Amino acid sequence: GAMGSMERASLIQKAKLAEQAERYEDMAAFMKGAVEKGEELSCEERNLLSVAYKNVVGGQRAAWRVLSSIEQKSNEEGSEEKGPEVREYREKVETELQGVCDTVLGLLDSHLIKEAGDAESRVFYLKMKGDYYRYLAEVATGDDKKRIIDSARSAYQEAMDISKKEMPPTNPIRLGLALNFSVFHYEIANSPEEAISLAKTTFDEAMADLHTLSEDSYKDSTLIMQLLRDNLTLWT
């Protein structure tokens, strides 16, 4: 912990500066340091943690997919051998991606999930756990690929059970969870029908709850319902 020397409040203030600077590596290191102070995270602080690591791992996933595509093209029939460089560099990026996923899963495990009592915090962390097991699953090819997928499904399912009992169908974390769990069904678990069914059901129940919302809550929820509808338009 190179952040163990900095004040929790200064770590949070600098995570926000780093976001405005688009310095997501710094933002994640700052939020990592804030979590390691051992206090629970506020709603705003959870978003900073999530936003920071999503941008870091998003840059790595984009790079992994470009290199994996170049590597597959060089394994065609009539492809000209170019040596091990494509595979070595795809392995390097992949190893770096797995380290970020393991760092995040380590923070949720020590000890964010076990101290998260409120529905909103616990559903948020269990979603994050499903998401980062999902990113590991995107690059997994060995024996543990099945175990990684089940680790993602298991965390997603527990978040879904809580969010169904404890949150309205329009709650943005509940809709974001359903969006992501749906995509997991589609492209990780080979369950495109389950993916479509969850997205349609999530969209319909939120639509029926919109009348209870203020104009700002209504804008938050409708934004996420539009992402559900876009996925459904793409898959049907």
Binding site: Y24, K54, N55, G58, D131, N180, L227, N231
Partner: peptide, 10 residues
């Protein structure tokens, strides 16, 4: 057009 997940990159 990539399917959507949340949160999205900057």
């Amino acid at each position: 057009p990539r399917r959507n997940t949340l949160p999205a990159m900057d």
